[PDB]
């Protein structure tokens, strides 16, 4: 329950105009100034494009989202218990990287519920008002709890971007240090370290001061960078055929590429500040770095052993403490358009999984965008939202 | 932040029709089978009527909340930075109980922001959406906490009504049992007991099993009921001269009178089961009782003692445990939200009436001389 107590109608309706990339939004973005304006649905399509198989001999890209006219007037949608919506169409482009052949099509991506003049939606005849929400603002947040069972003191940390996957570390009751990538299952943190190119020697050179890091390294079953990369792939894409190259591409696109990851200026500043990085640098790139990952793990571990300061290589000394003040200032306001955009992403990612798996079972000459694209996860996500 | 994630527009517009007691609502509430329907503003006026002076020699009562036409239309209010509103009038009659004379007048209560067809309000030209909230449902809720500085287990309890003042008890890290009334400042719980007419002997008799209750009673600097009542009044009403009577009156009005306090049937039931009170008896009232207050303190105290069972005098055995307040919760519509701000404004308007009832000449007293609508317009202006 994180809804606003009060909303400005115009701010929310403007955010829906943005989400659908409407003309009025373009001219409002043109006056207020200025260029590089990207629609909400535009962004989502741009983010996941291109979708590739593990080979990767196939790619599929999305672009140019637009709408047809509404299927029925509002009053007709009310007196017939229908949803006020407009058909969504995108430009999908399939590429066979072996031949270089390109197959472009227009694809229907489902009926998209449109905001009325009242700033409302009409779902199944019922008029609804979507409320803006207060969510955790970008940053890196450390905390402390007590285990329900053994009553040991536990520490965890969340790297929360403005946009993209979550990265979570924790010390558990079995004295291990773990990593959760994109809310997936828990792995020993040494796995992620190796996937980034760290040898066991470098790991003990850096984290040898901690015994739980030395024990985690022992009870860690991966041997080498390649094996760690594949363990991550299996945790994130179960049932799908792993390769060293696609897992490597996967990890890069999760945190280190601007396309699907963004801390934004506020997140990048707060991460630098908290960990003592970029001591004299301005904010340019808003992706995570290898330094951020290593620093965060070190911070968590020193926090667990009861240390109060720390200094990363080339950084300044910072206090090591929980961010227990995870209230007031550490929250931001997500408009209606942004909320819908987020649910679109979720549906899109499930659609993206089906594309990859259909790329491995379909005949490459019969493969078109239409054969690859199942829009059900997208219409189910919107359905779930309302 | 406790707003809904989604509202149904027809629910919110209906709640506003209910608030202003419109004919549209009165119809809608007739076909639904609601017998004897009462509007939102109408309900509030009843809760505070009549306002009687201490001596019982005069009274002031309110009725018939009604509106004229709105000042400017929606468009005109948007263009001129005007608030889209309609003047509110009530009927207020003053009775002199000595002479039997009645003085009835129509009183202006201020400009009332009206909800549009979009479920919005135009305030100074800007269109705004008030959001329904999810609040804690009625009942009595015990929880457990760990103090960082001592690793001590702390327990707290909140008695939440459907309508009215909160009541909180807690065990701190100094092993004192305290109370917060209407979310005001903490006092030792023995002050509340003394204020309710309990003596130290009666307190030691009922709560002697607890060392922290003995300790709280020791460190309690209040001697007797009268001193306890004054201390409470000081905490609840700062800057104001504390008398004997206006302290007892305040405490009665907080929890034990229907005018200002309502557990609702769900609350009354939940409190009964939790504390093992009136096991088979039917619900006759939804106010708090002294029995509830004492039982709640005892529960919290036994909870801290590590005890697993409690049997209140004349009650049944209940398990002693914390509550896992996960879900419950209830929905407060926009109309109900506005109604609560009206209550606040009206209650301040009420205190001024009582003040003016003392210092004015009864033969010159009219409803217009008693009613100052400034706290009401302030509560409304603040809300939006």
From Swiss-Prot, chain B:
The RNAP catalytic core consists of 2 alpha, 1 beta, 1 beta' and 1 omega subunit. When a sigma factor is associated with the core the holoenzyme is formed, which can initiate transcription. This is DNA-directed RNA polymerase subunit beta. DNA-dependent RNA polymerase catalyzes the transcription of DNA into RNA using the four ribonucleoside triphosphates as substrates. The lineage of its organism: Bacteria, Bacillati, Actinomycetota, Actinomycetes, Mycobacteriales. Belongs to the RNA polymerase beta chain family.
């Amino acid at each position: 329950p994180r809804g606003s107590h009060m909303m400005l109608l115009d701010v929310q309706t403007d955010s829906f105009e943005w989400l659908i990339g409407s003309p009025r939004w373009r001219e409002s973005a043109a006056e207020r100034g200025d260029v590089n304006p990207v629609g909400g649905l535009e962004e989502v399509l741009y983010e996941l494009s291109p979708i590739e198989d593990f080979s990767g001999s196939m790619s599929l890209s999305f672009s140019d989202p637009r709408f047809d006219d509404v299927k029925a007037p509002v009053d007709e949608c009310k007196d017939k218990d229908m949803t006020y919506a407009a058909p969504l169409f995108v430009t999908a482009e399939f590429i066979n990287n072996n031949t270089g052949e390109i197959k472009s099509q227009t694809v229907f991506m489902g009926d998209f519920p449109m905001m009325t003049e009242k700033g409302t939606f009409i779902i199944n005849g019922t008029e609804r008002v979507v409320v803006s929400q207060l969510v955790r603002s970008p940053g890196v947040y450390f905390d402390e709890t007590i285990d329900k069972s053994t009553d040991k003191t536990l520490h965890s940390v969340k790297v929360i971007p403005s946009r993209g996957a979550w990265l979570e570390f924790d010390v558990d009751k079995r004295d291990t240090v773990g990593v959760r990538i994109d809310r997936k299952r828990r792995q020993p943190v040494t796995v992620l370290l190796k996937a980034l190119g760290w040898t066991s020697e470098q790991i003990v050179e850096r984290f040898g001061f901690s015994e739980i890091m030395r024990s985690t390294l022992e009870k860690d079953n991966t041997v080498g960078t390649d094996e760690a990369l594949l363990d991550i792939y299996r945790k994130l894409r179960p049932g799908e055929p792993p390769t060293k190259e696609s897992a490597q591409t996967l990890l890069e696109n999760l945190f280190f590429k601007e396309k699907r990851y963004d801390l934004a200026r506020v997140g990048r500043y707060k991460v630098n500040k908290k960990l003592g990085l970029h001591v004299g640098e301005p904010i340019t790139s808003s992706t995570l770095t290898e330094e951020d990952v290593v620093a965060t793990i070190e911070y968590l571990v020193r926090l667990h052993e009861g240390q109060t300061t720390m200094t990363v290589p080339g950084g300044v000394e910072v206090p090591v403490e929980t961010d227990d003040i995870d209230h007031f200032g550490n929250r931001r306001l997500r408009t209606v358009g942004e909320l819908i955009q987020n649910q679109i992403r979720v549906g899109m990612s499930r659609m993206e999984r089906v594309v990859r798996e259909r790329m491995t079972t379909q005949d490459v000459e019969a493969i078109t965008p239409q054969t690859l694209i199942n829009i059900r996860p997208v219409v189910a996500a919107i359905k779930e939202f309302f």
